Amino acid sequence: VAVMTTLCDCKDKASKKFSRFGIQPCFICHGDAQDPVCLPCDHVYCLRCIQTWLIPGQMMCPYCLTDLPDKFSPTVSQDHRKAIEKHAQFRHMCNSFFVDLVSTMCFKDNTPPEKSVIDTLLSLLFVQKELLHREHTKSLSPFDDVVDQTPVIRSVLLKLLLKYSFHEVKDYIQNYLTQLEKKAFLTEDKTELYLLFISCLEDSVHQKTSAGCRNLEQVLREEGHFLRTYSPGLQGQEPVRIASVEYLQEVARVRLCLDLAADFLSELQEGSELAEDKRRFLKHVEEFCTRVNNDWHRVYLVRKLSSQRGMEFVQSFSKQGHPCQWVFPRKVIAQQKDHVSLMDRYLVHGNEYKAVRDATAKAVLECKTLDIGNALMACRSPKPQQTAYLLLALYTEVAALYRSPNGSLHPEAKQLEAVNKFIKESKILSDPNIRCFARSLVDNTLPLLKIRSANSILKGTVTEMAVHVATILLCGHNQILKPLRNLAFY
Ligand SMILES: [Zn+2]
């Protein structure tokens, strides 16, 4: 309190000495002014505020109620601007010093500070009702002359308050939550605030676990014990408003547990047996997933699995009898076929490769080949990128046909003659380089499909990247691509 009053009256005296006894911002916007205008009552208001408020029949002062004689004509471009800049520099220095002081002195060790200090820290953030919007939130400003015209919630105070153990900081954050939901965030999208809180708690628990000196087995034992003794207690904080801190801690803990579990599942998929102890953790995860029906946890698990590894990971993971099926719901496995196809990632260009690839697919299933020509003739992005899309569509169609065993060697079933006639007729790709590339591609003699990769997972991605960079080089008549062309082809 003593140092806070020292900072406050130091700022007051500094401003008084700097700019002639008390520069004050605009009373309407309550923030630092742009293009300052000086009233006869030694008042500084914003140009926009004064132009939007002094136009009607209220030629007076919102602060001290003094009549304005003529107009807001006198503006000071010499003293007010420099004084405002100096006071802003001092206020930013004070804010940075205050945040550094609270970060260092208030959390030196594992002992929390007193109570009134935390209460004043969480109470100074507001600009509570003044006679005139009301009750804005600040970016840790010990002063009252800085606001924003929107209630904004940060997380620096919350994060710095979660550094200690969660057992002794629940009431303070609970009071802060009740304040925010009672005064600024009564009825709105509370999902954003809930996810902000849960992410802050994930960060805090990650800091606590990583910074500590403990082996992984102790944490695994505690996690398994919690999983095996977790009473649901879900219905307590569900319906519309109630969200206890304990519930948030529990869901954060299960988030961390399933994050690690997905990491371990990916590691098992890319590796050998799991040392007979990680298997117990995965079995506990499976029993937890099959015991509770809150399928959001498995949704998050598969989302994290896709983020770490990719869509192809779950695509191969969703087969028909692999001993890892508990990560799917009872409905996804029910109506999923064995004909899951690869992904047409070349849609980056936008609404042009899709049409040509659909035309190529229709020409593949049928015998007519005029559809791809019609699709090519009805689009922008001329000849270079046009032929790029055409040949990429042909490659992806032939790859989809070959990789799937049911329709292997499909073009050889009276369809390669159609594509050969299409190449012969249309002159859009009747260039020797494109012609020989297509001749290699159609009969699958290109030396890229036979990558002989034992993993057979990323080999499709590798071939896709190789053929895509080859297409970019072939269709790119650019000076920057000449060395790459020479490296790839000569
Ligand atoms: Zn203003």
UniProtKB/Swiss-Prot annotation:
Record-listed Zn(2+) 1 binding positions: C26, C29, C46, C49
ZnF locations on chain (RING-type): 26-65
Top-level taxon: Eukaryota
Sites where the protein binds Zn(2+) 2: C41, H43, C61, C64
Effects seen without this gene: No visible phenotype. Males and female are fertile and produce normal-sized litters. Mice do not spontaneously develop Moyamoya disease, a chronic occlusive cerebrovascular disease. Mice are however more susceptible to Rift Valley fever virus infection. Mice show elevated expression of MMP9.
Subcellular compartments: Cytoplasm, Cytosol; Lipid droplet
Entry comment, domain topic: Composed of an N-terminal stalk, a dynein-like core comprised of two catalytically active and four inactive ATPase domains, and a C-terminal E3 module. The ATPase regions do not generate movement but rather act like an intricate molecular 'switch'. The RING-type zinc finger domain is required for the ubiquitin-protein ligase activity.
Complex and partners: Monomer. Interacts with UBE2L3/UBCH7; UBE2L3/UBCH7 is the most efficient ubiquitin-conjugating enzyme E2 for the ubiquitin ligase activity. Interacts with UBE2N/UBC13; promoting 'Lys-63'-linked ubiquitination of target proteins.
Family (UniProt): Belongs to the AAA ATPase family.
Function: Atypical E3 ubiquitin ligase that can catalyze ubiquitination of both proteins and lipids, and which is involved in various processes, such as lipid metabolism, angiogenesis and cell-autonomous immunity. Acts as a key immune sensor by catalyzing ubiquitination of the lipid A moiety of bacterial lipopolysaccharide (LPS) via its RZ-type zinc-finger: restricts the proliferation of cytosolic bacteria, such as Salmonella, by generating the bacterial ubiquitin coat through the ubiquitination of LPS.
Name of the molecule in the record: E3 ubiquitin-protein ligase RNF213
GN (gene name): Rnf213
